[PDB]
């Protein structure tokens, strides 16, 4: 069972092809499972103070990878914790901040397999000495009026399971189309279809229903699980519920269509 994400109501006549369009781009799945769980945390600084100054990509780090400092000069100057992914801390350290280092830094984490990303901005204003060095909040970020000529630390720590390597059951995208018929309860609804990112497909009901009740052929290649119900019978009414699950990422989406069928007179 999947928690409520989208609920909808549909109405159609018997003998017509219904389309209960369930889709989730986050259910898109990569055929390559070679350490697909790669995480890249990188720091991007834009020096808005120096007019229109090209932003500098100071440092990259990859879970199961090195902390490559982009420019040879910044080596040593830019530092990120080596256990960053292990503990979730992705803060930066500038060993000796100077006027050249001033600007809005931005840490960005990217998860390839889930095709997910996050990021937060932190400003670094360089003041000559300690008489004007402090920290404050501008409204969307933390700003550090840093001590020129001394180490300054720009904080960001993402305390979430998505950015940690603890075992996650290596789950993959799965989908369950059920149909709570009139008088039936949800989560007991007779299963209509079952799909997995590996292409596993299961159909339910009489073969004619399976022919009429069918999900697209390349569901997970598109993140689509639209359910076609050809030549609707009035018994094909009820609450159709598509439960989309990806336990490795935490996806627990529910997409529901209350398809009530009608007949002529």
Partner 1 sequence: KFHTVVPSPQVKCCGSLECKASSKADYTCRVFGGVYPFMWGGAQCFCDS
Partner 2 sequence: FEHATTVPNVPGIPYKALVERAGYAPLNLEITVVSSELTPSTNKEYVTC
Enumerate binding residues for partner 2 (CB under 8 A): 72-73, 75-77
25 binds, among partner 1, partner 2, none (CB under 5 to 8 A by kind): none
Q: Which two tokens stand for residue 82?
A: 């080596």
**Contact flag: residue 53 with partner 1 (CB under 8 A):** yes
Residues 24, 21: Cα–Cα separation, whole Å? 10
Q: Which of 92, 90, 88 is nearest to 104 (CA)?
A: 92
- Position 100 contacts partner 1 (CB under 8 A): no
Q: Which is nearer to partner 1, 99 or 211 (CB)?
A: 99
User: In the window 153-172, what residues touch partner 1 (CB under 8 A)?
Assistant: none
Given partner 2, partner 1, none, residue 76, with its beta carbon under 5 to 8 Å by kind, binds partner 2
Q: How far is the CB of 46 from partner 1 (least distance, A)?
A: 13
The DSSP 8-state label assigned to residue 204 in this structure reads -
Distances (CA, A) of 201 to 143, 220, 236, 242: 52, 12, 21, 14
Nearer to partner 2, 92 or 122 (CB): 92
Residue 72 or 83: the one with the smaller Cβ distance to partner 2 is 72
Would you say 120 and 106 are in contact if contact means Cβ atoms under 8 Å apart? yes
Query: Based on CB atoms, which residue is closest to partner 2, 148 or 224?
Result: 148
d(CA 196, CA 217): 12
Residue 131: both structure tokens together? 């008489």
187: left (phi over 0), alpha (psi -120 to 50) or beta: left
Give the residue with the Cβ less far from partner 1, 53 or 198: 53
The partner in contact with residue 37, picked from partner 2, partner 1, none with C-beta cut-offs of 5 to 8 angstroms by kind, is none
Stretch that binds partner 1, among 49-57, 62-70, 217-225, 246-254 (CB under 8 A): 49-57
Q: Which does 53 bind (CB under 5 to 8 A by kind): partner 2, partner 1, none?
A: partner 1
How many alpha carbons lie under 13 Å from residue 43 in its C-beta half-sphere? 32
User: Which among 208, 178, 227 has a CA at the least distance from the CA of 19?
Assistant: 227
Residues in contact with partner 1 by the rule CB under 8 A:
51-54
């Amino acid at each position: 069972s999947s928690s409520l994400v989208s609920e909808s109501v549909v109405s159609l006549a018997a003998g017509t092809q219904a389309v209960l369009r369930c889709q989730s781009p986050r259910m898109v799945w990569t055929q390559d499972r070679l350490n697909d769980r790669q995480r890249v945390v990188h720091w991007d600084v834009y020096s808005t103070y120096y007019g229109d100054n090209k932003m500098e990509r100071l440092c990259d780090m990859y879970s199961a990878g090195d902390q490559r400092v982009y420019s040879s000069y910044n080596q040593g100057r830019i530092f990120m914790p080596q256990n960053a992914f292990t503990d979730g801390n992705f803060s930066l350290v500038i060993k000796d901040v100077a006027e050249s280092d001033g600007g809005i830094y931005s840490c960005n984490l990217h998860h390839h397999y889930c095709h997910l990303y996050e990021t937060v901005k932190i400003q670094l204003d360089v003041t000559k000495k300690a008489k004007a060095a402090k920290e404050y909040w501008d409204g969307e970020k933390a700003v550090i009026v840093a001590l020129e000529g001394s180490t300054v630390m720009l904080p960001c720590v993402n305390r979430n399971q998505i950015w940690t390597e603890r075992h996650l059951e290596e789950a993959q995208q799965v989908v369950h189309w059920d149909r709570q018929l009139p008088g039936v309860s949800h989560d007991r609804a007779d299963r209509l279809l079952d799909l997995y990112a590996s292409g596993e497909r299961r159909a339910y009901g009489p073969p004619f229903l399976r022919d009429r009740v069918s999900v697209n052929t390349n569901a997970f290649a598109r993140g689509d699980f639209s359910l076609r119900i050809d030549e609707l019978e009035r018994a094909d009414e009820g609450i159709y519920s598509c439960h989309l699950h990806h336990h490795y990422c935490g996806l627990h989406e529910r997409r529901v269509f209350h398809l009530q069928v009608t007949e002529p007179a």
